[PDB]
Every structure is written in structure tokens, then in C-alpha cells.
Structure prediction request, 125 residues.
Amino acid sequence: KGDTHIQFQISPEGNGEVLLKSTETGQYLRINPDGTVDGTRDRSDTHIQFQISPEGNGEVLLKSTETGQYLRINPDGTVDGTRDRSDTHIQFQISPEGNGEVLLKSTETGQYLRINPDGTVDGTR
Prediction:
């Protein structure tokens, strides 16, 4: 939890969409059509638009709207997209740390989402 690349801002975009942005670099989380996940500064990229979908008891899904893929953190720390809504590795807890900064913690594995400064995305405990 002491990692320096795990804090995000959540920017509302109306119509119920949000952007998930690294506080360090301003890079936005992106799910590509091929299921890979990375970071980009391209504000106009359609693949950075997310919907936060409540599951109950405070768990949420983070769904990339353009291609309907849910963010997944696997036990091995890799991050990808999936359409399998029953996967236990797509549930997140949004944990604020003050001033609009949050950690995005994947419930099943205890991993925090991380966007490294090179735009690579992974999980760290």
C-alpha cells in the first residue's frame, strides 16, 4: 500500500461516465479492444471512459464503456479486461485517502491497481 504509483483521481464526465487518472502522471486508465490494459494521456481516447457499477455491500465493478470490459487484477499481478461478470477478480473497493485521491483495491487478491510512469498497468499488494 506504500507504492507511489497507486493513487488515482476520479473525474466525472456526465452521463454517468468517469475517467480514472494517475495522480502522479495524469495518465488515464485504458482498456483496449484486445483486453490489454495500459495508460494514456490522450483525453480523446474512447477507451478511457469508465462506469462504476455498484455490486452491493460497497463492492464495485470498473467497466470500460466503449467495449464493455471489466477491469480485472489477477493473482499474479497482471491486469486485463474481461466480459465475464461472474469473475471474482473484477470486484473493487474504492478507498479514498483525502483530497479526492483514491486507491483502487481488488477485493479478492488484496492488490492495488498501479499505473507505472511508463503507462504499464499492474497490481501490487
Summary: Residues 1-125 form a domain with the Trefoil (Acidic Fibroblast Growth Factor, subunit A) fold (CATH 2.80.10.50). The radius of gyration is 13 Å. The chain has one domain: 1-125. The CA atoms of residues 39 and 119 lie 4 Å apart.
